Design a protein around this nucleic acid. Structure first.
Lengths: 56, 56
DNA sequence: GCGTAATCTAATCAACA
DNA sequence: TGTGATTAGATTACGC
């Protein structure tokens, strides 16, 4: 009943890690910007940031 | 900065409440179906279902 | 002003590879 | 066999 597991390539992961090192708590504007930049739904990016902050 | 508060009209709330009374833990397919039906992003519908289960 | 949409942490599951 | 997705609790704080 779960969604298909989202896959991130090297460029998307690099951009996400750069934005995370800049700010671990991005606002809705920055999340929407990343969503339009790397072509990933914004909810997926919010989940990615939450998982990242959880692991560290 | 937070996202703008999503607004639901009477019809959207009615459809969501009927689907909730049918199944409080909808799969990704039903959430995407409701998203296409009432024209609301699927993440918003998942959040709505979680908040509903949270009240009840 | 209240109801409830939104966001976070802590925990757990499971899918693609 | 080894990280994205989901859930439950707390909270903050807009829209109507």
């Amino acid at each position: 009943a779960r969604r298909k597991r989202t896959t991130f390539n090297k460029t998307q992961l690099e951009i996400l890690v750069k934005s995370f090192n800049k700010d671990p708590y991005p606002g809705i504007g920055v999340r929407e910007h990343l969503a339009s930049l790397i072509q990933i739904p914004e909810s997926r990016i919010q989940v990615w940031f939450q998982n990242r902050r959880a692991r560290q």
